[PDB]
Design a protein around this ligand. Structure first.
Ligand SMILES: Cc1cc2occ(CN(C)CCN(C)Cc3cn(-c4cccc(C(F)(F)F)c4)c4ccccc34)c(=O)c2cc1C
Ligand SMILES: Cc1cc2occ(CN(C)CCN(C)Cc3cn(-c4cccc(C(F)(F)F)c4)c4ccccc34)c(=O)c2cc1C
Lengths: 129, 141, 140, 132
């Protein structure tokens, strides 16, 4: 009965990383954000896949970050890659103490580079400890 | 009441990778302590241990840049520093900025009082400009 | 793609813990070998390693019975035997007793590493039925 | 896309360990058994919790085993087994390993003493597979 979530990205969304409604024991998906049903320790994780065709002239940075909106806002986890056909994953994860009704966003800078070749390989989840 | 920790690099500590718990969304719970820049395990057990360090440089002056990241254990009973996890990266094969995140994770039998270090060789390439980019944590299983 | 193994004790080997792949439902796939009673890793990587041993005795003649189970790694460039996982049990504090010992963890391994899973008391080993003593790895 | 299952025991079954109907990507539960939808390497795991009050004169042995029913090869063997001798006591038994399975193979997770099952914690008696 411990809160758990695992949302996957909508491949058919336009210029957005958008999460599709596992969402169990009180975790909600609202406003593209995971809402935590109770205070406690949560493992938070995500994976986004990026792909591109060759290397252009403007230098490509790929960013991915998980943020906590404490209903204050702050970056929990963030990573950046500089890919310059190329393929890059960015993973994030850790344990955090969260408050009831906190909201969690997992965001990127370049939705156009998203790689939906493998289904459900772009995800975001939490598991309460 | 599982021991758990998640510490983050100190963005005011130049030329060092210094871990902090006293930040919003860094964590020491249920007995894990941070002392002398090391996580101290409060009780014997199985622990998932993980880290991410973000390296960044401006251009490649040399092909010989080598970035290392390691997590090691020091046991009270066997004062030797023993590596648990390590990775090495060569970011420069040949002036725009390169980024190289290094991730370490594994599941280890740890003893009461073990000290866990997470270290790098090049704190001048460390990127803690934004929060969330350099971290080190453990979860008792 | 990933290297994987799951080996089981030889019920015909008395006084030892001898692993087998050549049984129905034991496995060596994608490069893992079993040689000199050890699993040999085919490539550098992160590996979940696990074992279960079932010990069984008939009564407690002594409170000093001690059961150990360990998994060790021998690296080509190191040659020192280094413990990855270990447990100890004292079954007799004072009829058959049973003590399953479970080991599990996730380790960085190199090409050619040799993994050993051993016990101190093969006379207490219970491989009467299948599935009771096993040792495996899964590349992650 | 990879087959996965995790079924939990029915706390209201009589004199039996009975799995309730995730169950995705082709895994089925049929005749109290998980059925594999494709050939491949599977992680198989389970946990059963037993509990009892004090220790009697009859010696309590608790067994738990996972079996592979190979349908076309027509044979049936234990994949994983363990035994505990508990003699208010509490005992878990875990099982797990990686196995190569064939399409339509059926998997059972069985015990010897359903009367000792401990349903005190709801989501703690379970049986699952994860295709690699
Ligand atoms: C902190 C961290 C350490 C890590 O260390 C090792 C690996 C390599 N692997 C375990 C297999 C390759 N992967 C991509 C798997 C993976 C591993 N983790 C992971 C591993 C350990 C600890 C955590 C955390 F959530 F607890 F912080 C996550 C993932 C989280 C999200 C998506 C994928 C993963 C990682 O991928 C990794 C990822 C992260 C985020
Ligand atoms: C082979 C084996 C090794 C093991 O080594 C370590 C532990 C100790 N722990 C991780 C404490 C937490 N547990 C009891 C949970 C647990 C750990 N495993 C587990 C761990 C490693 C490998 C596997 C396997 F599925 F790959 F075989 C299972 C479970 C399988 C089913 C139900 C529960 C578990 C185990 O419980 C364990 C269980 C098993 C079955």
């Amino acid at each position: 009965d411990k809160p758990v979530a695992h949302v996957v990205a909508n491949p058919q969304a336009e210029g957005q990383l958008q999460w599709l409604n596992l969402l169990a024991n009180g975790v909600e998906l609202r406003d593209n954000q995971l809402v935590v049903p109770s205070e406690g320790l949560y493992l938070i994780y995500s994976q986004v896949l990026f792909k591109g065709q060759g290397c252009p002239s403007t230098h490509v940075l790929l960013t991915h970050t998980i943020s906590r909106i404490a209903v204050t806002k702050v970056n929990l986890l963030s990573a950046i890659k500089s890919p310059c056909p190329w393929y890059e994953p960015i993973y994030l994860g850790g344990v955090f103490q969260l408050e009831k009704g906190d909201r969690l966003s997992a965001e990127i800078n370049r939705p156009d580079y998203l790689d939906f070749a493998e289904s459900g390989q772009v995800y975001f989840g939490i598991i309460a400890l």
